[PDB]
Symmetry: D2
Subunit: 263 residues, 4 copies
């Protein structure tokens, strides 16, 4: 079927790419980077993030596959020296499809219109100059007034990323939820924050509303653009999910174990 492959940039990844495209020529595999059904990322998790946003409009018809040319990643689980068996399994169509939840980021302005974003790892909101002060509104109800560096809403699969370094909890990707973590909160008598990471289920909306400043630095999967005149930033579990092609069994907790503890 219609597949494609993205490469990191180094010689090792570009070399492995051509050999797989060749391999896919021995079967009924058509190379198409416009309407693919299988997107293969070769490199790392950062490379995988690029391949995700490259096809965020066609997430429903694409099963992603990651290959790490360096160290083991949470999205790139396949070793380079396993690409032959990967090609054969991807030719017969002998694989199941596992789906991970995603984060929907909506930013509102002083109405130009509305900007929606999709996060695989997480979405963060910081300031653009001095202090970052917003009001956290959970389900149309005020929860706290934040003051610090920013806030980080993470995906279940993104919990092992920026979320963990910020003190967040590690959630299994089978759980459809989102986790909110604080970034250097001052937490005083005026700006009293919960401190603890917050895990929100489906259909729960976390609305960030400005206080004195409306210029924020919104980052989604490390794409960080400056949004001016912001009126509202909404977080919620997107109905859209990213699909993975499962062949073998690489448990999430083992992948966490092999990454943070020891391999």
């Amino acid at each position: 079927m219609k597949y494609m492959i993205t490469s990191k940039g180094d010689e090792k990844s570009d070399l492995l790419r051509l050999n797989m495209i060749a391999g896919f020529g021995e079967y009924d595999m058509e190379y198409d980077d416009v309407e693919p059904e299988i997107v293969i990322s070769i490199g790392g998790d950062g490379t995988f993030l690029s391949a995700f946003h490259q096809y965020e409009e066609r997430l429903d018809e694409i099963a992603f596959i990651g290959i790490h040319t360096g160290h083991l990643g949470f999205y790139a689980d396949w070793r380079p020296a396993e690409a032959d068996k990967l090609v054969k399994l991807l030719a017969k169509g002998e694989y199941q499809k596992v789906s991970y939840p995603l984060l929907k980021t909506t930013v509102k302005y002083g109405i130009k219109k509305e900007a929606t974003y999709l996060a695989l790892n997480e979405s963060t909101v910081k300031s653009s100059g001095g202090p970052f002060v917003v009001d956290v509104v959970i389900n149309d109800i005020h929860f706290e007034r934040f003051r610090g560096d920013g806030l980080c809403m993470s995906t279940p699969s993104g919990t092992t990323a920026y979320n963990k370094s910020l003190g967040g909890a590690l959630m299994h990707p089978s759980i459809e939820a989102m986790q909110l973590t604080e970034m250097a909160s001052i937490n005083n008598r005026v700006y009293r924050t919960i401190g603890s990471p917050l895990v929100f289920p489906k259909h729960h909306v976390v609305s960030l509303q400005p206080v004195n400043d409306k210029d924020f630095q919104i980052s989604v999967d490390h794409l960080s653009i400056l949004h001016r005149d912001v009126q509202e930033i909404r977080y919620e579990v997107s109905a859209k999910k990213i699909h993975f092609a499962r062949f073998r069994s690489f448990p999430f907790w083992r992948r966490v174990h092999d990454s943070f503890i020891e391999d």
Copy 2:
């Protein structure tokens, strides 16, 4: 229908209790402390925990309701000066039923199963050294005070104090947090709290010591000659009686951030 009421022990809880039994005599409510359908807890969260474990065998037919005589609790959501409206609403039978997930604690050596509403902790008796096994696979070797497996509703309890995350009770999962773990060259732990979904089993296995103190929601028992302590999301769920809308996040807000109208 068949109801009952548990009391803390002080006069404030005991006085308010009788006043509800009286009010409920004006309706078709049969007072039964053996086989109730609606259990009312008066006191605090600790009192509510007692009401849960007192009738954990008949969770299937019981809708729990909590009343706090002191400060606002996460299970005791109803204020004393609202007890008048509760009997009226609970007599007509006009209420919805919200269910929260529970934690199943299994100990092996006679195998002992326990059910947790808040959380379950495992400590030593000197040093506490165990092996954390996730789904029949080794994850880490723990060394510290102990480990805490929490329920979503129990995240706002001991879990929060240990630096754990606050999880919404609509999520069927369980959270594992560390209790003062040492992180040196020999015992590298994950550090971060771990949230496990359903059908995921976290097994704690002893190393060079077999005497641990297992604690289950406001309890504490000494288990001797322990070979395995298994954790998993229980199939059993606790049922609450809903009349109005008191969001989970509001009870978190009113507890830790501020309560400006009180």
Copy 3:
């Protein structure tokens, strides 16, 4: 004597400024070149500016902070006490409390640039990952990877340091505290995790790994330093002087900020 006053920018600070400057019209001469008493009106951020404005003549200046807004750790005196301050600052009836400072030294591939910190000095990246080697007293300690590192002053512990999970140190202690900023604690970059408090004559040297362009921030100024070879941290011999009139305990000031 030779004094001066800096203002935050809002109407409250400029109004309070003029009202105090008049008040002194005693043997008080307004001088912004060689002052002996610098009064900051606004907030802690305003006070930091007044510190860096006269970081060259720190031995002859006793600072006084007035907060027009919420209570600060440097601007501790309330506006409705500016009346008595003028009289007390006229007799010369005051004692002198000194707080430690942080010395930041940067080396290139050239010379070297030294900086003075009242709150703290942080070193982050300029784009992607921040990877450096933490060297304590010419000895390797760890290889860090995350957002950055924060070396704080005792008086600056109640600022960014606390938000990063750092410990609160009393300003009577001559030391410095190093805290981590979202460090990835994995198998390759194993960091200590816990904040590190270093005494006097102890040098913490941050040395680059693959990148040599860092965003070095001192207190309130954050500039981008290219071709960085070494960043050294140590407790500076220079100290900031305060004019103490009444008794406002440090822990009491911490209580009033975070607990009430």
Copy 4:
């Protein structure tokens, strides 16, 4: 005028006799601890009144400790060299006043249910605590229980003490600081009960049950522990080799 303390095992007892050949256990000037840090604490508490006249030396028969710095199979050179670094200590007073001396730290937890006290710093109320307990640590004891509780690691050349929280609920009624607190010399931290007055007071895990407690005072002790320095093992290296491998 020296002496040697042993862990209890044969390996330590064997090494003990071999060093004795190379003695006063009433008026010693040089104390050698053979075993571990826990064993080292016993040798410390055994002579806390004459700490001013004793230079301590630790030898680990097991893993490397922060107090047991000397290797067992290199102890041969030690007798010749033994023929001065000072670390701060913690003073714990319980209210008739009962004084205690801590090398690592002194902790206070409950004895049944909740642990609720009022933290009073220099005769001034700071916060009302509610949780498992509180931990006041020495600079040298920061690498012990203090670190596990999320405390900061301070160098032993600093004369101070660090207070860390143990599972604080930290809510709107019991608002705690959260951050570890470092107090200098002549600073007194007074812990005062609310309802229950029976707590488990622990000094170097010498946990005794104190009934009818009215006040628990913490302050940097004037007495300091002395070590016999022969080589140079930096504190941060000792931290490095332990946690960073």
